[PDB]
Amino acid sequence: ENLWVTVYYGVPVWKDAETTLFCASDAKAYETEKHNVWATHACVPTDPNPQEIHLENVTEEFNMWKNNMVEQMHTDIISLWDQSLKPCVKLTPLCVTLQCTNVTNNITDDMRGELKNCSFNMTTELRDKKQKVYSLFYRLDVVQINKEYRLINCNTSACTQICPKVSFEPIPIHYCAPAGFAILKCKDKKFNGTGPCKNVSTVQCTHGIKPVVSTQLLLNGSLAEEEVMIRSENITNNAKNIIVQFNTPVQINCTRPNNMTRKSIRIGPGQAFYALGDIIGDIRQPHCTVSKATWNETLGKVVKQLRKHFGNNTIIFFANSSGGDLEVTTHSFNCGGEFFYCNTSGLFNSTWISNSNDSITLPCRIKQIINMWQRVGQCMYAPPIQGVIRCVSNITGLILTRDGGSTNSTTETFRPGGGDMRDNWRSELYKYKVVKIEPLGVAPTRCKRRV
Amino acid sequence: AVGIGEVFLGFLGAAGSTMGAASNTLTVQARQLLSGIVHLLKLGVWGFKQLQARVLAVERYLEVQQLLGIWGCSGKLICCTNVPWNSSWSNRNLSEIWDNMTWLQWDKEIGNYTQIIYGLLEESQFQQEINEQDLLALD
Amino acid sequence: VQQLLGIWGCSGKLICCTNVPWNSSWSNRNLSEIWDNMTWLQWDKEIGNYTQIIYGLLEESQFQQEINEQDLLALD
Amino acid sequence: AVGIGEVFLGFLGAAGSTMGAASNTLTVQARQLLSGIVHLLKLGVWGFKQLQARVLAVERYLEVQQLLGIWGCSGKLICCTNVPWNSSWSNRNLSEIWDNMTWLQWDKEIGNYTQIIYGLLEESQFQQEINEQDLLALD
Amino acid sequence: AIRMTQSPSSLSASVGDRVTITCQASQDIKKSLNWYRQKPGKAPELLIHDASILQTGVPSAFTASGSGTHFSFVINKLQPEDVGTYFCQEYENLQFTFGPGTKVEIKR
Amino acid sequence: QVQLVESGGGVVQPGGSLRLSCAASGFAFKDFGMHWVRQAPGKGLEWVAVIGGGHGQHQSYSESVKGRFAITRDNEKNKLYLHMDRLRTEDTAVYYCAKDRLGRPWNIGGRLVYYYYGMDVWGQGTTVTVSS
Ligand SMILES: *[C@@H]1O[C@H](CO)[C@@H](O[C@@H]2O[C@H](CO)[C@@H](O[C@@H]3O[C@H](CO[C@H]4O[C@H](CO)[C@@H](O)[C@H](O)[C@@H]4O)[C@@H](O)[C@H](O[C@H]4O[C@H](CO)[C@@H](O)[C@H](O)[C@@H]4O[C@H]4O[C@H](CO)[C@@H](O)[C@H](O)[C@@H]4O)[C@@H]3O)[C@H](O)[C@H]2NC(C)=O)[C@H](O)[C@H]1NC(C)=O
Ligand SMILES: *[C@@H]1O[C@H](CO)[C@@H](O[C@@H]2O[C@H](CO)[C@@H](O[C@@H]3O[C@H](CO[C@H]4O[C@H](CO)[C@@H](O)[C@H](O)[C@@H]4O)[C@@H](O)[C@H](O[C@H]4O[C@H](CO)[C@@H](O)[C@H](O)[C@@H]4O)[C@@H]3O)[C@H](O)[C@H]2NC(C)=O)[C@H](O)[C@H]1NC(C)=O
Ligand SMILES: *[C@@H]1O[C@H](CO)[C@@H](O[C@@H]2O[C@H](CO)[C@@H](O[C@@H]3O[C@H](CO[C@H]4O[C@H](CO)[C@@H](O)[C@H](O)[C@@H]4O)[C@@H](O)[C@H](O[C@H]4O[C@H](CO)[C@@H](O)[C@H](O)[C@@H]4O)[C@@H]3O)[C@H](O)[C@H]2NC(C)=O)[C@H](O)[C@H]1NC(C)=O
Ligand SMILES: *[C@@H]1O[C@H](CO)[C@@H](O[C@@H]2O[C@H](CO)[C@@H](O[C@@H]3O[C@H](CO[C@H]4O[C@H](CO)[C@@H](O)[C@H](O)[C@@H]4O)[C@@H](O)[C@H](O[C@H]4O[C@H](CO)[C@@H](O)[C@H](O)[C@@H]4O)[C@@H]3O)[C@H](O)[C@H]2NC(C)=O)[C@H](O)[C@H]1NC(C)=O
Ligand SMILES: *[C@@H]1O[C@H](CO)[C@@H](O[C@@H]2O[C@H](CO)[C@@H](O[C@@H]3O[C@H](CO)[C@@H](O)[C@H](O)[C@@H]3O)[C@H](O)[C@H]2NC(C)=O)[C@H](O)[C@H]1NC(C)=O
Ligand SMILES: *[C@@H]1O[C@H](CO)[C@@H](O[C@@H]2O[C@H](CO)[C@@H](O[C@@H]3O[C@H](CO)[C@@H](O)[C@H](O)[C@@H]3O)[C@H](O)[C@H]2NC(C)=O)[C@H](O)[C@H]1NC(C)=O
Ligand SMILES: *[C@@H]1O[C@H](CO)[C@@H](O[C@@H]2O[C@H](CO)[C@@H](O)[C@H](O)[C@H]2NC(C)=O)[C@H](O)[C@H]1NC(C)=O
Ligand SMILES: *[C@@H]1O[C@H](CO)[C@@H](O[C@@H]2O[C@H](CO)[C@@H](O)[C@H](O)[C@H]2NC(C)=O)[C@H](O)[C@H]1NC(C)=O
Ligand SMILES: *[C@@H]1O[C@H](CO)[C@@H](O[C@@H]2O[C@H](CO)[C@@H](O)[C@H](O)[C@H]2NC(C)=O)[C@H](O)[C@H]1NC(C)=O
Ligand SMILES: *[C@@H]1O[C@H](CO)[C@@H](O[C@@H]2O[C@H](CO)[C@@H](O)[C@H](O)[C@H]2NC(C)=O)[C@H](O)[C@H]1NC(C)=O
Ligand SMILES: *[C@@H]1O[C@H](CO)[C@@H](O[C@@H]2O[C@H](CO)[C@@H](O)[C@H](O)[C@H]2NC(C)=O)[C@H](O)[C@H]1NC(C)=O
Ligand SMILES: *[C@@H]1O[C@H](CO)[C@@H](O[C@@H]2O[C@H](CO)[C@@H](O)[C@H](O)[C@H]2NC(C)=O)[C@H](O)[C@H]1NC(C)=O
Ligand SMILES: *[C@@H]1O[C@H](CO)[C@@H](O[C@@H]2O[C@H](CO)[C@@H](O)[C@H](O)[C@H]2NC(C)=O)[C@H](O)[C@H]1NC(C)=O
Ligand SMILES: *[C@@H]1O[C@H](CO)[C@@H](O[C@@H]2O[C@H](CO)[C@@H](O)[C@H](O)[C@H]2NC(C)=O)[C@H](O)[C@H]1NC(C)=O
Ligand SMILES: *[C@@H]1O[C@H](CO)[C@@H](O[C@@H]2O[C@H](CO)[C@@H](O)[C@H](O)[C@H]2NC(C)=O)[C@H](O)[C@H]1NC(C)=O
Ligand SMILES: *[C@@H]1O[C@H](CO)[C@@H](O[C@@H]2O[C@H](CO)[C@@H](O)[C@H](O)[C@H]2NC(C)=O)[C@H](O)[C@H]1NC(C)=O
Ligand SMILES: *[C@@H]1O[C@H](CO)[C@@H](O)[C@H](O)[C@H]1NC(C)=O
């Protein structure tokens, strides 16, 4: 028979693509008026009733390890933090000689030498006058020059003090696609991050993603619906990190019990430096606590899921971190504005062979000079928070690394890992992909154009 | 017994539907290509990026419309042509294509001949314009 | 705006006639009143409630016109 | 003996060709007007300048298309009209223009009457729309 | 909305005689009928769909005829493995109303 | 063959809740709609609820159970779930799950429509009982 080309405009066809998504937030942040970086510089109001269309018959290939959404989110968060820090105070004058003594006023043995009482000369609002002041500095934030100390950052760069009016608390962020692009979502319960998905949908915006910055433990994230999920770009390659998603959260209570006082020191015209004035009461180690039974059950489930890839009879070892700097060797996070680094050796100290409120306690240290994003030369100073700090969070996942193993295959040991925040974003964006619409189609019909 | 969906399919709702049935919801995709799914940026990296994306979207939409006009199919969602179908591109009969295939499958099948078809459409439209001018100059 | 006009089958035209009949519910004024005693601002105020209904009807009519065109001319 | 060029003329390749022959390569110039000759800018003076240029190009292209539509010639590379030619604009016979002249020479010759012709095209198209409405209202 | 009645309530028939069950609908369905058999203390089976077509996997020992509002189920020779509750169902609307059921037994 | 096994039926007090699960095998679960049918003790069959095929975007419930019953599928699990909530004395019965001859979602005129043509294959039975 006679067939002719026919053109269709607006056909449902798409290809894998990369683009620039935009971000949306709920009105609640606008009602806080605490100047959240995301709601202030990047995001717009969220749609009251987001649209989700379920694509019947559609099976789509996903790969969470080659998703540009993660890269865009990493770049966006870094840029927003830098932008929020631009108008803040630069602590150049703070790079001076410090005369430091111990703080032995009712301290515990574990907190001996952790805090230092440092006196120094500082500039005033008058360029021709100097003021002798004192402050308390954490042992990690100072280094001995030769009783003489200097700030750790003084030989690398000057730190920018965080503006107390700016809030970095994670508020949910939705990523939304512009014209000509779509976001596809995999709703399979046992989707491992790579391969086909048979239950696909298209969404205007992603679900509320909280950009939580943490290491060795994913906090306040999404949970698996059926069972614990193990995800890795290549499980057999020990050099690739493993992302573990829990089906039930694990409560973690972190606290700084020391009652701290914030003191303002005028270092220039309109320039104030917020230091630690004094400690009211005794000095105790900040610490985190998790239930022993819940952690043991979660580790058992994780081991059960790992044995599907590493053998039903292989011995599984959970050991602490190998080495590196404080950020990677410790569970690092932000509690009420203070930067905690906690020792997780008590969490990964187990053996499994394939055969009640003890409340595991993790000691923690606190830092004020912060190097984020694994960068160098852009240090940030965190002003102290007045009072006693307590936060409660949910461990929803882990980042793990496997040792080489020597190919013996008899045993496998896993250690907490992290550092690169891109894995944290992948833990939430694994189910999303971006596609570009191709609206033009050509097909045969019996329709023929007039002459 | 007939069960009825609450609302029309929506954006990409016919991606898994047959090519014949998907023709009833081309307008939604066409609209999305320009306006997205149915305030002011600030100077900065983020705002500049968004403005670049919007300009790119406008350019892409205009490129598609330019192609349609060049084929003589401007202002139409379904446009018939004078270009005969070559069985080399595909030998499937009409029933298979329009009742047992999706547009994604069809694109996978005939993705190799798309540019050839586009060029043929261009030539046919140009010849149509020339012949129109000559035939109607004879008037 | 141009996309809407094209979707209605009225691309490249300042005045475009359609196949959608007028519903007296939208307005019962006779032609003389509208076209010799009314302004476009007044008309917009009067029929602003039914604008989206009319737009949807135009969309449906144009789509049906395209489908019927294809079928009728495939018979050729 | 016939020598043949490797490829079709290309962008502006017919600038020196006769007006009749140049009609075969209008599409290339039309495409270039929008997309240029067949990634992301960074915030700064340079990127801002480039984005301004791209927006200006889009506006210019849309202005041309708006003019064509206003003349009733949307979606066409060659459009015939109802406006008679005035010998005052040019008295050259058809053979001279379409076999012995280039478009650049023609533009130089009739550059003074271009706006007059544009206005006449506008009026003719508007009258055509009005007469169409009345004639077909009689139906 | 659509009321479905089977008559008679029960039937006692000899081995090898015609058995007829009448099905009455308040509103016309005219093609949407299913004839089910639920043997005593067992799951139901589907015999005829559309009131005229036998279901695959069953011998041609049952017939159905009807339209509009009236339908009829006809049984071939009443073999011993035939006793069961015969149900007359409609699928013209989203309620899938069932019939009260008809009890068929052999002479005894 | 096309086999349906039903489970999850026990005993629950009035005003409570119960979940019934049906496992399907021998056929494409996603390609057919499914019905929940109830046989009251000594009474006739009574249709309860139906869910369309595929993603199960359509659900229809009997007026007797409307507002307190919910039907659900799991195509990966090949499981059909009924969420009996706010039970009453009359809900005690034998509940069957049956495969519809059709019910696959269809695109007709740009709309999602489901054609249900009855029940071709039934399960074997699962009894629920309410007492107090
Ligand atoms: C995982 O998710 C959990 C829960 O989502 C989250 O825990 C939450 O953490 C946030 C921040 O750490 C908590 O919010 C703070 O809560 C304290 C405690 O106040 C309680 O009581 C008041 C009484 O009205 C309630 O309104 C309040 O909601 C709490 O229930 C507040 O004091 C905090 O507000 C102060 O700090 C804010 C930020 O600085 C200021 O914007 C605000 O105006 C308040 O100012 C105070 O501090 C200033 C210095 O910072 C000082 O200058 C002022 O004068 C004033 O003293 C804040 O609202 C929230 O309660 C937690 N929720 C739960 C359930 O625990 C985890 O943190 C999260 N995990 C991670 C890793 O992110
Ligand atoms: C970090 O390091 C800084 C500096 O070394 C410490 O600051 C010092 O704290 C001590 C103890 O509080 C201060 O000494 C005390 O000052 C009290 C306040 O009096 C002021 O006014 C009087 C009268 O003009 C002055 O003589 C005096 O110098 C102060 O300027 C005095 O009342 C105290 O003496 C009286 O009370 C005590 C306690 O009851 C009695 O034992 C005495 O006999 C007397 O009756 C005492 O002199 C000192 O001045 C502070 N220095 C500065 C520069 O501020 C921080 O405490 C330290 N922090 C930590 C955590 O280690
Ligand atoms: C996920 O991660 C796993 C683990 O890293 C990868 O598996 C590795 O794959 C590589 C490449 O195929 C393997 O290396 C190759 O091994 C071949 C088999 O030889 C075995 O025995 C010899 C004995 O001497 C060992 O040296 C060797 O490592 C193997 O154990 C070799 O024949 C190959 O040699 C050839 O290729 C190399 C590389 O190009 C050349 O340099 C050589 O000259 C030669 O031409 C090669 O060495 C590796 O052994 C695998 N490891 C394990 C533990 O299985 C997966 O590939 C990865 N998956 C994805 C998708 O990336
Ligand atoms: C997901 O994937 C499934 C599987 O492919 C799709 O299911 C198909 O859905 C289409 C409708 O979208 C079905 O087609 C329709 O068939 C109706 C009748 O078909 C019967 O009768 C014909 C007679 O020739 C037989 O050939 C056929 O086998 C059936 O027995 C038509 O009535 C429908 O409309 C047609 O007729 C009307 C007039 O009545 C015209 O106006 C229409 O333009 C059209 O010509 C329609 O053609 C198709 O049968 C289904 N296939 C299967 C295997 O079930 C889903 O659609 C797809 N999408 C979704 C969202 O699930
Ligand atoms: C803040 O600045 C003041 C003034 O610069 C510092 O005090 C000064 O300290 C120096 C060094 O200790 C003193 O010089 C030394 O004096 C001793 C006698 O005490 C002498 O033996 C040494 O040879 C040397 O000359 C200087 O006199 C002193 N000036 C004062 C007190 O006015 C002070 O140390 C600074 N504070 C900090 C925390 O650095
Ligand atoms: C990791 O796990 C190991 C094994 O559970 C821990 O080592 C064990 O720690 C307990 C508690 O300190 C030891 O018990 C103690 O023994 C001493 C000596 O007999 C006794 O005096 C104490 O009262 C207590 O009973 C146990 O011996 C010890 N075992 C080994 C092999 O070292 C280890 O501490 C854990 N690490 C972390 C960081 O939690
Ligand atoms: C001041 O603090 C420093 C740092 O903690 C102390 O130095 C340590 O003191 C202990 C106790 O004598 C020694 O065992 C260590 O070897 C010292 N060095 C380190 C690196 O810990 C110092 O003793 C403290 N002095 C006073 C008076 O409190
Ligand atoms: C940590 O997890 C617990 C348990 O999932 C959360 O507590 C529940 O929060 C949901 C919020 O919708 C409530 O509906 C539940 O009633 C809460 N309790 C239980 C037992 O589920 C808690 O909110 C989580 N905390 C954070 C910070 O995410
Ligand atoms: C995630 O699941 C996919 C399949 O759904 C896995 O990919 C398969 O891996 C096996 C080896 O285990 C290969 O034999 C297959 O050819 C792969 N198929 C596809 C489509 O990828 C993938 O390995 C899984 N990833 C994990 C468990 O990390
Ligand atoms: C931390 O220290 C401050 C200051 O010492 C405490 O504030 C006092 O609170 C009590 C009531 O608990 C009041 O009677 C005092 O007037 C307050 N003094 C101030 C504000 O200077 C605060 O309560 C302490 N917090 C904790 C948890 O111990
Ligand atoms: C973390 O803190 C919460 C409170 O913020 C603790 O929850 C309390 O747990 C005790 C003991 O089980 C109960 O008596 C309280 O009623 C709980 N209060 C609540 C839930 O608000 C929780 O136990 C802590 N977890 C630890 C220390 O591991
Ligand atoms: C975290 O805690 C563990 C145990 O509580 C500490 O382990 C000790 O580490 C020292 C220093 O290398 C070793 O000599 C001891 O063998 C360890 N003791 C125990 C109890 O195992 C570990 O030091 C802590 N991490 C850091 C860096 O402070
Ligand atoms: C359909 O397409 C094929 C190409 O796939 C055309 O066949 C070509 O014809 C040209 C012109 O004669 C030859 O130069 C090529 O060598 C041919 N290639 C092949 C693979 O056959 C065919 O002519 C087209 N059909 C029609 C009707 O034009
Ligand atoms: C003119 O518009 C009215 C609505 O204002 C149409 O009347 C509706 O018709 C539909 C379809 O029968 C009913 O469901 C509505 O209840 C009616 N509403 C009202 C207010 O009457 C009317 O049909 C339209 N006229 C034409 C010719 O279509
Ligand atoms: C061709 O153009 C000329 C103008 O160059 C037209 O002549 C003008 O006609 C108007 C109307 O009568 C007069 O007001 C002008 O004075 C005339 N100018 C000149 C220079 O003659 C002429 O009418 C046009 N030809 C046609 C057929 O309309
Ligand atoms: C695909 O996943 C969605 C989301 O879970 C399934 O639809 C959900 O079904 C469960 C149980 O009925 C509930 O969460 C909601 O009723 C549904 N949610 C939404 C947003 O529709 C859907 O059934 C799945 N499709 C399959 C498995 O084919
Ligand atoms: C891990 O534990 C060992 C043994 O207790 C200890 O020597 C090592 O320092 C620990 N590593 C970290 C990073 O805490």
Chains that touch E (3 or more CB pairs under 8 A): B, F
- Comparing C-alpha atoms, which of F25, F117, F1, F13 is closest to residue F80? F25
CB A396 within 8 A of CB A221: yes
| Helix H or strand E encompassing D119 | helix D114-137
In angstroms, the CA F70 to CA A40 distance is 43
Contact B3 E94 (CB under 8 A): yes
F96 DSSP 8-state letter: E
Q: For residue C66, give the chain B residue with the closest CA.
A: B78
Pairing mode, strands A194-197 and A160-161: unpaired
Q: For residue A14, give the chain B residue with the closest CA.
A: B104
Contact B1 F111 (CB under 8 A): no
Contact F108 B21 (CB under 8 A): yes
In angstroms, the CA B111 to CA B91 distance is 15
- Closest Cβ–Cβ partner in A56, A188, A189 for F105: A56
Pairing mode, strands A432-437 and A181-186: antiparallel
CB A223 within 8 A of CB A262: no
| Helix H or strand E encompassing C35 | helix C31-37
Q: How far apart are the first and last CA of chain C?
A: 35
Measured from the Cβ of residue C43, the count of other Cβ atoms closer than 10 Å reads 14
Q: How far apart, in Å, are the Cα atoms of A384 and each of A33, A87, A164, A416?
A: 21, 19, 10, 29
CA A227-A229-A234 angle, 5° bins: 155
- B4 at the F interface (CB within 8 A)? yes
In angstroms, the CA E35 to CA D100 distance is 87
In angstroms, the CA D66 to CA D57 distance is 14
What are the residue ranges of helices labelled H in D17-92? 19-22, 26-35, 45-70
CA A130 to chain centre: 41
For ligand 10, say whether the CB of A387 is within 6 Å of any of its atoms: yes
Q: Which residues contact C74 (CB under 8 A, 6 or more apart)?
A: A445, A446, A447, A448
For residue A292, report the distance from its CA to the centre of ligand 1, in Å. 27
CA A50 to chain centre: 26
Q: How far apart are the first and last CA of chain D?
A: 60
CB F13 within 8 A of CB F130: yes
Single-letter residue type at C76: D
- Comparing C-alpha atoms, which of E42, E26, E103 is closest to residue F39? E42
The two tokens of residue D65 are 């298309």
- B38 at the E interface (CB within 8 A)? no
- F25 at the B interface (CB within 8 A)? no
Contacts of D31 in chain B (CB under 8 A): 66
The two tokens of residue A67 are 């998703």
| Helix H or strand E encompassing B84 | strand B78-84
In total, the C-beta contacts within 8 angstroms joining chain B to chain D are 55
Scanning the structure block, which residue is given the tokens 């040019």?
Answer: D90
The two tokens of residue F26 are 């021998």
The two tokens of residue A196 are 């086909």
- Sequence spans of domains, chain E: 1-107
Let me know how long chain F is.
132
What are the residue ranges of helices labelled H in chain B? 19-22, 26-35, 45-70, 94-100, 103-110, 114-137
For residue A363, report the distance from its CA to the centre of ligand 12, in Å. 11
At B80 the three-state DSSP class reads strand
Measured from the Cβ of residue E18, the count of other Cβ atoms closer than 10 Å reads 11
Single-letter residue type at A215: T
Protein residues with CB under 6 Å of any ligand 13 atom:
B 86, 88
At B31 the three-state DSSP class reads helix
- Comparing C-alpha atoms, which of C59, B79, E93, A445 is closest to residue F110? C59
Pairing mode, strands E10-13 and E102-106: parallel
CB F78 within 8 A of CB F85: no
- F104 at the B interface (CB within 8 A)? no
* Deposited experimental method: cryo-EM
The two tokens of residue F87 are 């039970």
In angstroms, the CA A434 to CA A15 distance is 9
In angstroms, the CA A91 to CA A277 distance is 18
Measured from the Cβ of residue A24, the count of other Cβ atoms closer than 10 Å reads 23
Q: Which residues contact D53 (CB under 8 A, 6 or more apart)?
A: none
What 3 state SS string does chain A have? CCCEEEEEECCCCEEECCCCCEEEECHHHHHHCCCEHHHHHCCEECCCCCCEEECCCCCEEEEHHHCHHHHHHHHHHHHHHHHHHCCCCECCCCCCCEEEEECCCCECHHHCCCEEEEEEEEECCCCCCEEEEEEEEEHHHEEECCCEEEEHHHHCCCCEECCCCCECCCCCEEEECCCCEEEEEECCCCCCCEEEECCEEEECECCCECCCCCCCCEECCCCCCCCCEEECCCCCCCCCCEEEEEEEEEEEEEEEEEEEEEEEEEEECCEEEEEEEEEECCECCCEEEECHHHHHHHHHHHHHHHHHHHCCCCEEEECCCCCCCHHHHCEEEEECCEEEEECCCCCCCEEECCCCCCCEEEEEEEECEECCCCCCCCCEECCCCCEEEEEEEEEEEEEEEECCHHHCCCEEEEEECCCCCHHHHHHHHCCEEEEEECCEEEEEECCCCCC
In angstroms, the CA A231 to CA A244 distance is 6
Best residue in B34, B66, B68 to probe D by mutation, most D CBs within 10 Å? B66
Q: How far apart are the first and last CA of chain F?
A: 40
Any contact of A with C, at least 3 CB pairs below 8 A? yes
CB A158 within 8 A of CB A135: no
For residue B80, report the distance from its CA to the centre of ligand 13, in Å. 23
- Comparing C-alpha atoms, which of A85, A229, A274 is closest to residue A168? A85
Q: Would you tell me the crossing angle of helices D26-35 and D45-70 to the nearest 10 degrees? A: 140
In angstroms, the CA A174 to CA A262 distance is 36
Q: Which residues contact C21 (CB under 8 A, 6 or more apart)?
A: none
Contact B74 C11 (CB under 8 A): yes
- Closest Cβ–Cβ partner in B2, B22, B24 for F113: B2
Single-letter residue type at A403: D
In angstroms, the CA D104 to CA A58 distance is 55
For residue D41, report the distance from its CA to the centre of ligand 7, in Å. 56
Q: How far apart, in Å, are the Cα atoms of A22 and each of A68, A175, A181?
A: 13, 6, 12
| Ligand with an atom nearest the CA of residue A203 | 16
| E8 prior amide bond cis, ω within 30 | yes
Closest C-alpha residue for ligand 15 atom 3: D88
In angstroms, the CA F81 to CA E75 distance is 37
In angstroms, the CA E98 to CA E55 distance is 18
Scanning the structure block, which residue is given the tokens 């004839």?
Answer: E35
Closest C-alpha residue for ligand 1 atom 54: A386
Diameter of chain A measured on Cα atoms: 99
Chain B residues with CB under 8 Å of a chain C CB are 23-24, 27, 30-31, 34, 74-78, 80
* Dihedral of alpha carbons A166, A167, A168, A170, sign: negative
Contacts of B23 in chain C (CB under 8 A): 67
CB E6 within 8 A of CB E98: no
- Comparing C-alpha atoms, which of A58, B16, B95, B1 is closest to residue F107? B16
Phi-psi region of E75 (alpha: psi -120 to 50; beta: other; left: phi over 0): beta
Measured from the Cβ of residue A209, the count of other Cβ atoms closer than 10 Å reads 22
In angstroms, the CA A267 to CA A273 distance is 7
- E1 at the B interface (CB within 8 A)? no
Q: How far apart are the first and last CA of chain A?
A: 20
- Comparing C-alpha atoms, which of F61, F60, F62, F67 is closest to residue F86? F67
D124 DSSP 8-state letter: H
E81 DSSP 8-state letter: G
In angstroms, the CA A442 to CA B3 distance is 33
**Resolution given for this structure, in angstroms:** 2.3
The two tokens of residue B20 are 């014949």
Scanning the structure block, which residue is given the tokens 């999706």?
Answer: B102
| Helix H or strand E encompassing D100 | helix D94-100
Q: For residue B7, give the chain F residue with the closest CA.
A: F111
The two tokens of residue D100 are 């012995």
Q: For residue B3, give the chain F residue with the closest CA.
A: F114
CA E34-E37-E43 angle, 5° bins: 115
| Helix H or strand E encompassing C2 | helix C2-7
DSSP lists the bridge partners of residue A5 as A444
- Comparing C-alpha atoms, which of D7, D8, D3, D4 is closest to residue D25? D8
In angstroms, the CA E103 to CA F12 distance is 32
Q: Which residues contact C36 (CB under 8 A, 6 or more apart)?
A: none
Q: What is the dihedral of CA A266, A271, A274, A278, to 10 degrees?
A: 0
Best residue in A9, A206, A451 to probe B by mutation, most B CBs within 10 Å? A9
Q: What is the dihedral of CA F45, F50, F52, F57, to 10 degrees?
A: 180
- Closest Cβ–Cβ partner in B1, B3, B17 for F107: B17
Q: Which residues contact B40 (CB under 8 A, 6 or more apart)?
A: none
- Phi then psi for residue A209, to 5 deg, are -105, 125
Q: How far is B29 from chain F (nearest CA, A)?
A: 13
CA D64-D70-D76 angle, 5° bins: 65
Of A262, A280, A282, the residue with max ligand 10 atoms within 8 A of its CB, to mutate for a pocket test, comes to A280
In angstroms, the CA E86 to CA B112 distance is 59
Q: How far is A55 from chain B (nearest CA, A)?
A: 5
Measured from the Cβ of residue F101, the count of other Cβ atoms closer than 10 Å reads 19
In angstroms, the CA D35 to CA D40 distance is 16
Q: Which residues contact C2 (CB under 8 A, 6 or more apart)?
A: C11
Best residue in E39, E91, E97 to probe F by mutation, most F CBs within 10 Å? E91
F10 DSSP 8-state letter: -
For residue A289, report the distance from its CA to the centre of ligand 14, in Å. 67
* Dihedral of alpha carbons A307, A309, A311, A312, sign: positive
In angstroms, the CA B38 to CA B24 distance is 18
For residue A128, report the distance from its CA to the centre of ligand 2, in Å. 27
Q: How far apart are the first and last CA of chain B?
A: 60
For ligand 6, say whether the CB of A363 is within 6 Å of any of its atoms: no
> How much of chain C is in helix, strand and coil states, percent to nearest 5?
60, 0, 40
Contacts of B27 in chain C (CB under 8 A): 7, 59, 63
In angstroms, the CA D20 to CA D41 distance is 42
Q: How far is A190 from chain F (nearest CA, A)?
A: 9
DSSP lists the bridge partners of residue B58 as none
In angstroms, the CA E27 to CA E4 distance is 9
- Closest Cβ–Cβ partner in F46, F63, F123 for E98: F46
CB A43 within 8 A of CB A1: no
The two tokens of residue E86 are 């015969």
CB A423 within 8 A of CB A231: no
- B2 at the F interface (CB within 8 A)? yes
- Comparing C-alpha atoms, which of A191, A213, A187, A183 is closest to residue A200? A187
Atom of ligand 9 nearest to the CA of A194: 1
Q: Would you tell me the crossing angle of helices A422-429 and A68-85 to the nearest 10 degrees? A: 130
In angstroms, the CA E61 to CA E68 distance is 24
Contacts of E96 in chain B (CB under 8 A): 1
Best residue in D63, D65, D66, D129 to probe C by mutation, most C CBs within 10 Å? D129
In angstroms, the CA F36 to CA F18 distance is 14
The two tokens of residue A117 are 């009482």
- F31 at the A interface (CB within 8 A)? no
- Sequence spans of domains, chain F: 1-132
F26 DSSP 8-state letter: S
Q: How far is F12 from chain E (nearest CA, A)?
A: 24
In angstroms, the CA A241 to CA D79 distance is 64
Q: Which CATH number fits domain E1-107: 3.40.640.10, 3.90.79.10, 3.40.50.300, 2.60.40.10?
A: 2.60.40.10
